[PDB]
Amino acid sequence: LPDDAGVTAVAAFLSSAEEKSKVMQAANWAECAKVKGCNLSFRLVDEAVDLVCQSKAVREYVSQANQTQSDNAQKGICLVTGKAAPIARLHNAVKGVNAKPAPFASVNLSAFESYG
DNA sequence: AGGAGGGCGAGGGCGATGCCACCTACGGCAAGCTGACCCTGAAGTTCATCTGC
């Protein structure tokens, strides 16, 4: 995804090792270090509300990286909709129930698995 | 000797058996603590172990 100026910016910020060091020397960095599992994200300036992961190329990339990579998986068949719709192992971490986002529907122990 | 030993009918009548108020005051009915430990997870990989080579 080149010529974005949002990800070329961060890819030039993630090939820096010093500006990232400058992130620790920020006014409020001491308050993000307090929260375990802080989630930083990359809003390039000159978009002003829009993250690097909000530009209409990363937006399309994700809409392309959730339409190509998450479509070659196990071909069928949906429990929910019944369509072919490639099957999703690893249901996504439903947040707000547990102490951590937990996979609402998740059969992961040696025998909760039914038929192998 | 042969006596007669009461006969009668009354034995309450009248009303009153309570009046008055009071039957509580006061305040407190809790304090203090705890109400749970412990684990049990998805997901993934490692790592010890097994089978086969």
TrEMBL record:
Organism superkingdom: Bacteria
Protein name stated in the entry: CRISPR-associated protein, Csd1 family
Species name: Neisseria lactamica ATCC 23970
Annotated gene: csd1
Shown segment, full-protein numbering: 118 to 233 of 585
